[PDB]
Structure formats: structure tokens, C-alpha cells
Amino acid sequence: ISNDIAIDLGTANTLIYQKGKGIVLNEPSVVALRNVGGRKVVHAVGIEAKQMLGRTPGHMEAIRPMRDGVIADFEVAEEMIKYFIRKVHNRKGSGNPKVIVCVPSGATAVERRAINDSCLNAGARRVGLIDEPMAAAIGAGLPIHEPTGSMVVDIGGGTTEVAVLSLSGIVYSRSVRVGGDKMDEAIISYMRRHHNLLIGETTAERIKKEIGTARAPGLSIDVKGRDLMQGVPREVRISEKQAADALAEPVGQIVEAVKVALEATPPELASDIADKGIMLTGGGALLRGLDAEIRDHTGLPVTVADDPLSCVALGCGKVLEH
Numbered sequence: 604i605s606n607d608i609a610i611d612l613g614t615a616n617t618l619i620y621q622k623g624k625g626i627v628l629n630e631p632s633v634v635a636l637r638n639v640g641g642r643k644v645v646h647a648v649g650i651e652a653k654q655m656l657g658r659t660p661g662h663m664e665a666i667r668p669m670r671d672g673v674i675a676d677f678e679v680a681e682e683m684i685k686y687f688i689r690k691v692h693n694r695k696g697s698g699n700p701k702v703i704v705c706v707p708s709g710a711t712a713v714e715r716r717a718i719n720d721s722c723l724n725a726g727a728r729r730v731g732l733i734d735e736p737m738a739a740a741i742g743a744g745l746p747i748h749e750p751t752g753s754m755v756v757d758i759g760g761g762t763t764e765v766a767v768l769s770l771s772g773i774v775y776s777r778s779v780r781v782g783g784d785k786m787d788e789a790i791i792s793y794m795r796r797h798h799n800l801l802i803g804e805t806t807a808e809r810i811k812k813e814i815g816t817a818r819a820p821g822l823s824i825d826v827k828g829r830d831l832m833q834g835v836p837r838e839v840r841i842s843e844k845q846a847a848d849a850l851a852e853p854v855g856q857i858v859e860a861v862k863v864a865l866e867a868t869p870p871e872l873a874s875d876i877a878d879k880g881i882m883l884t885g886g887g888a889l890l891r892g893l894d895a896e897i898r899d900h901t902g903l904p905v906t907v908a909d910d911p912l913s914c915v916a917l918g919c920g921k922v923l924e925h
């Protein structure tokens with residue numbers, strides 16, 4: 604019975620894998636703060652804090668401290684990490700926990716140090732950082748030990764991370780700020796301009812899951828929100844075609860991120876990727892039809908990982924057990 608853990612500290616979701624157990628926590632990367640006096644106190648972290656997005660009283664706020672793939676607020680990110688690490692601690696298990704945290708290719712020395720220290724301050728005795736695209740690839744079942752290159756396209760909340768891997772190493776990696784959040788924001792902007800309806804970010808994500816698609820058909824759902832000009836609540840019906848229209852720009856920007864990475868690939872790795880194609884991971888990979896859009900624009904096979912939301916945690920989990 605161990606307290607050793609591997610953490611996927613995602614822009615939108617945090618997962619923890621505990622040695623010998625598997626994934627024991629999976630909660631939004633959100634912290635709610637309450638203004639008391641002139642200071643901010645931690646009010647909630649995780650599932651309850653996400654529920655407060657768009658619903659806070661004046662003296663509270665809900666923050667995603669990793670929202671854009673960078674640490675926006677070190678103290679709030681460290682409180683978020685300490686909360687989750689503390690939450691899964693098993694008093695029956697051994698002390699001196701070894702903690703592995705996944706780190707995106709773009710993370711700075713400053714951010715890596717800050718994650719290291721947050722884990723120490725949360726009780727870790729030793730901290731190891733592992734490259735996130737290696738984690739994604741492993742959890743997606745890619746044979747990353749083989750010499751032939753693999754390309755993984757990991758579409759998260761605040762970023763899409765693209766990497767080419769070979770012989771247990773990363774050869775190329777690029778990050779762009781397009782992913783699940785820009786898809787939500789596109790649906791917000793669509794509803795405003797086309798239906799004069801102002802919607803919250805949690806509603807926008809729901810619309811994306813229920814009817815979002817990367818290609819036109821279709822079916823319809825009710826969407827409720829705030830009237831633009833006059834401010835009273837009302838509702839309108841929106842279709843799959845309309846959702847496709849709304850998502851077309853951020854979908855195109857993901858496709859372009861994939862093309863840019865491909866265009867950097869040297870000849871022998873290009874031959875490797877032209878064979879095996881591209882593996883999609885992250886929750887953004889669940890967008891209906893995104894795989895076909897990428898296939899159509901690249902000419903390459905596109906596969907969606909099993910369980911795309913958990914690939915990174917599963918992969919670093921495997922590393923922790925070995």
C-alpha cells in the first residue's frame with residue numbers, strides 16, 4: 604500500500620493515478636476563492652468549484668489556474684495541487700511519497716520548479732517530472748519504444764500539443780492555444796452574434812458535447828441564456844448544422860496546428876508517419892468528426908485513442924509502476 608502518485612495537471616481536468624490502485628481522482632482544475640477582509644481564502648477546489656463558474660456572488664470567484672497551458676497564478680495553482688494530493692492520501696500506506704507530474708513541452712523552468720515545490724510542500728519526498736507527450740503516447744498504447752516515429756495530437760482544454768516520438772524520446776513538439784476552450788468560446792460568440800443570446804462557459808461546453816461536430820450533417824437542442832440587448836433569460840433552438848458552423852474556425856486552427864507539425868517532420872520520420880498516421884488524444888479528440896477533418900486535410904490516417912481523457916494519467920501511471 605503506497606502513497607506514490609502520478610499527476611496529470613491539466614488545463615481543465617486534474618487526474619491522479621496512485622501506485623497499486625489506478626486512477627483515484629478526476630476533477631476540474633478549478634479553484635473558488637472567497638474575499639474575506641481584503642484577502643482571498645480557498646473556498647472550494649475541483650468539482651464544486653467548476654459548478655460555480657458563471658454563478659458566483661460578488662465576493663467570490665472561480666479560477667482555472669492552468670487555463671491557457673501556463674501557470675496563471677502560482678499560489679492558486681499550488682493550493683489546487685495540495686488539495687488534490689492531500690485528498691488521495693492513504694494513511695495506511697507508506698510515507699516518503701514519490702510523485703510524478705506530467706509536464707507539457709512548453710513549460711518553463713520557472714513553472715517546472717514551481718510544480719516541484721508545490722508537490723514538496725504537499726508532502727512529497729521526491730518529485731519527478733515526465734514529458735507529457737510521452738505520457739499521452741504511452742497511455743494511448745503507442746509502441747513508443749520502437750524506432751519508427753509516432754505522432755500524437757493531444758487536444759486539451761487550453762492547448763493542443765503535437766509531438767513526434769521515437770525510441771522512447773520526443774523529436775519534435777509544438778503547442779498552440781486552440782483546443783476545447785476555443786471551441787466553447789466559438790459557440791459563445793456564435794450564440795451572441797447569430798441568436799442574440801449570451802451563454803455561460805459551462806452551457807457552451809454542454810452544447811459542444813451534445814451537438815458539436817467538426818462537419819455539417821441535423822438534430823437540435825434547446826439552449827438557454829441571457830438576452831443580449833435587454834438582459835432577461837430566454838431560450839432558442841440550435842442545430843447540429845449551426846454547431847458545425849460555430850466550430851469551424853477553431854476546428855480549422857487545430858487542423859492547421861497539425862499541418863504545421865507535419866511540415867517540420869524530416870524525411871525518415873515523414874515516411875514513418877505517412878504509414879502509421881496520427882493518434883488523437885485529449886478530451887478534444889471526442890469532438891465528432893474531428894478525426895475525419897484531420898484525415899481529409901492531411902491525407903494521413905487518423906486514429907482516436909481509447910479513453911482520450913485518461914491517456915496521460917494512464918501513461919504516467921504505467922511509468923510509476925515501473
Ligand SMILES: Nc1ncnc2c1ncn2[C@@H]1O[C@H](COP(=O)(O)OP(=O)(O)O)[C@@H](O)[C@H]1O
Pocket residue numbers: 612613614615616617758759760761762782783784808811812815884885886887888889890891911912
Ligand atoms: N464529448 C466531448 N466532445 C467534445 N469535447 C469534449 C468532450 N468531452 C470533453 N471535451 C473537452 O475536452 C477538454 C478537456 O480535455 P482534457 O484532455 O481533459 O484537457 P486538459 O488535459 O488540458 O485538462 C474540455 O474542453 C472538454 O470540454
Ligand SMILES: N=C(N)SCc1ccc(Cl)cc1
Pocket residue numbers: 611612613614669672673674705706707710711714715718735759
Ligand atoms: N499539463 C498541461 N498540459 S498544462 C498545465 C501545466 C502543468 C505543469 C507545468 Cl510545469 C506547466 C503547465
Ligand SMILES: [Mg+2]
Pocket residue numbers: 613614759885915
Ligand atoms: Mg492534458
